[PDB]
Design a protein around this ligand. Structure first.
Ligand SMILES: [Mn+2]
Ligand SMILES: [Mn+2]
Ligand SMILES: [Mn+2]
Ligand SMILES: [Mn+2]
Lengths: 200, 199, 200, 200
């Protein structure tokens, strides 16, 4: 099946004033769309190389699958772990199980957020900040992935895109304000489901 | 202590190819940050060394590389850029380098194609560079990721492909960015670096 | 203070037949010594470059500091988390607190060993396998570092060197038998102290 | 279905520069392992692609890179080696390449010293390569980490610097290994690759 761009589960302006409509449109229709197109071409290229038994080609195309495939995976998860304040955005208590696990690990929900913010701001270059679990209702950990590498060896609970294109038009260089503002639109209900499922 | 080097031209001197807004942020915010992070990083490696704390010494390594590289790349960037009415985009002001580029790629135009292709090929944050292996040596196009600086070769000129270098003006259209920056490339500076070939 | 090669806490053949005298001698007197020499040379070059306010040189030397500094750290810890069978080597009961924590995290000591061996055998190229903790008697985790990168952002409990020079003379390509045999000389007494201390 | 290519000479034909024991293990064990690894990774890749499993598709990309790169590298390696009687070390059997090397490094011997230095400078597992940008093009010495294959250039000849390539015979003395392998470099083959200049 040819991969396609998953529609957003809300209007492009539903996350304002935390994430502008302009960013949402470009981020989804341009960047994410590009990763989808790139993934399709890459797999097609890998397919031909495999059929031709061209090892050099198969290995070279590997980076493309990883970059575009990881981009597709990451953004698909990103769109879903966000929501407007009217649809549960920022409603941490709509995730009782995950919230209880978070407080046990970091002491409190707010302490967890400061640690997460710190991690996002510590990412050098393009990357993502993630809250992950080692299984259904498992132990929680904060991790980061570079460029468009996806979370592996664990199940993603929620992610925050730290590529500059995810916030520059609005927050400019002030990524600290983007990080602190995105908390208002985190779809915790979706995070609750991912944590309980603990599906890597 | 390291400091932020002033730009060699007004913040709007590169328009309409690079907006005044980007230059101010890119210089006063981004480059400044690498400068601050570098000083703070070297400070740590110092005390860490005098304390015989290898774990801490190695831990600061990344910060020194990221911020130090950040300081190096941007400092070179500002200098290999120039307004049109001041030599910007004037390839003929680099006789020796131009000739070498024509010999390597067949023509200046073919070199540009190769460079643009390379710039647009960068995944994530990085830089595109033209380098030489020595004074008036062999030319090559390379890239570095994040803020890693060119090593093992002498930088002739670089183009910042980090999103913050063009997003405000070109948005996601990095192709238009690569296309437009050729108009403000300071070839006179590239020429000096090439002839000097200072690794 | 110039860095020097730390003496082994036991004879060169005290670890046989799990690790030959020959390997220990070369691994210690040669490999580790090389990192020590490289570490001193790197820090000296970094100092001169710093004094000369030479950013390029400062940046370039970081790889040597990282590589050699890491090598010194990793092997220094390695010699200490190993011990003759008659001196507590392979005696997990000498690590009551650690063993308990290990049993709670992985269910049992054997299950932990399986997970560790799997991680060790999964390393591509040169690297290390580690059991770390986030703090004194904190949460345990299995991780790996590539080449000579040291454990950072966590406290090392014990590590296993998977570079080929650590086993090739005796096990040749059979790194699986090397992984299995080393558990016999693991100094759990040392791992206990490191875990209880939990010093990052 | 990928298979292990036979050697173009007996297992002891490269002595005393590379022992028979090394050749047998390196070829029959190590190289074979990458072949098997490549075959398995490719099958897992096809199954994931047909199941629309992007996460699984991305994950196996590293195995294709590592094993496929290992297969490519070793296959190139056996062919750019040869017994003294079969053209081993006969640099003048590569007129064009040699002229290019002398023009670049001043002399063939200066080239060898620079290459040895690059080889000894490799950190961890890796390879040393002499490459060209195209047919009878510009020469350059580079290195690749672990089993990464040469990309963006055409491999003229490579020297394996993984410890398994020399430890049994040279132990930690990689310098003597580098200096001895020049005697068995198949320059006739190098000449052909340089003239062809086929990237990959
Ligand atoms: Mn994004
Ligand atoms: Mn920049
Ligand atoms: Mn070792
Ligand atoms: Mn090998």
């Amino acid at each position: 099946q040819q991969y396609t761009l998953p529609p957003l589960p809300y209007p492009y302006d539903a996350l304002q004033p935390y994430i502008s409509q302009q960013i949402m449109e470009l981020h989804h229709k341009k960047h994410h769309q590009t990763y989808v197109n790139g993934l399709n071409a890459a797999l097609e290229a890998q397919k031909k190389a495999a059929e031709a038994t061209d090892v050099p080609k198969l290995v070279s195309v590997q980076q493309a699958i990883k970059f575009n495939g990881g981009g597709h995976i990451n953004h698909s998860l990103f769109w879903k772990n966000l929501a407007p304040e009217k649809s549960g955005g920022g409603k941490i208590d709509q995730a009782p199980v995950l919230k209880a696990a978070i407080e046990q690990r970091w002491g409190s929900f707010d302490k967890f957020k400061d640690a997460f913010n710190t991690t996002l701001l510590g990412i050098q270059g393009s990357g993502w900040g993630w809250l992950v679990t080692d299984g259904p209702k498992g132990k929680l950990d904060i991790t980061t992935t570079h460029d468009q590498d996806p979370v592996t060896g664990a199940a993603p609970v929620f992610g925050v895109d730290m590529w500059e294109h995810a916030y520059y038009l609005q927050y400019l260089n002030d990524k600290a304000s983007y990080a602190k503002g995105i908390w208002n639109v985190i779809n915790w209900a979706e995070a609750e489901n991912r944590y309980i499922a603990g599906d890597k």
